[PDB]
């Protein structure tokens, strides 16, 4: 519910947060299933809008 | 003033909203991919259309 309440702008900055946090590989590996669960629910719930965004910055971010 | 129409895709649950007011997540009809979180007064369910006098405003909680 906490991930369903937040709008798509907060979803985009959540993706920025995940993109920064998997450069610090210390707290990536100590929170791998939490990051996986939250990130996959977020883009699975917001999949229709995410694949309609047109920005190569977010495309490179997702990659 | 030009008005816009927006179909409910998800009635948001477990938000801490004030009673008689329910948050809701609507996607537009002129571009049926982008959403916005609104919060409506009467009884609402999924895939029904509601009328936004503005769409430049995300909804917070009410409480």
């Amino acid at each position: 519910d906490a991930l369903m309440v937040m709008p798509f702008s907060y979803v985009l900055k959540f993706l920025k947060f995940i993109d920064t946090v998997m450069q610090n590989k210390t707290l990536l590996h100590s929170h791998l299933p939490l990051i996986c669960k939250n990130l996959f629910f977020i883009i699975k719930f917001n999949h229709k809008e995410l694949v309609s965004q047109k920005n190569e910055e977010l495309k490179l971010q997702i990659n | 003033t030009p008005v816009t129409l927006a179909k409910v895709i998800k009635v948001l649950g477990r938000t801490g909203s004030r009673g008689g007011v329910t948050q809701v997540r609507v996607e537009f009809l002129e571009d049926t991919s982008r959403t916005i979180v609104r919060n409506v007064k009467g009884p609402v369910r999924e895939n029904d259309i509601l009328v936004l006098m503005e769409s430049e405003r995300e909804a917070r909680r009410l409480r």
Partner: peptide
């Protein structure tokens, strides 16, 4: 008193 979702949003 916020809740989950809006605490995560402001954070």
């Amino acid at each position: 008193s916020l809740k989950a979702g809006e605490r995560l949003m402001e954070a």
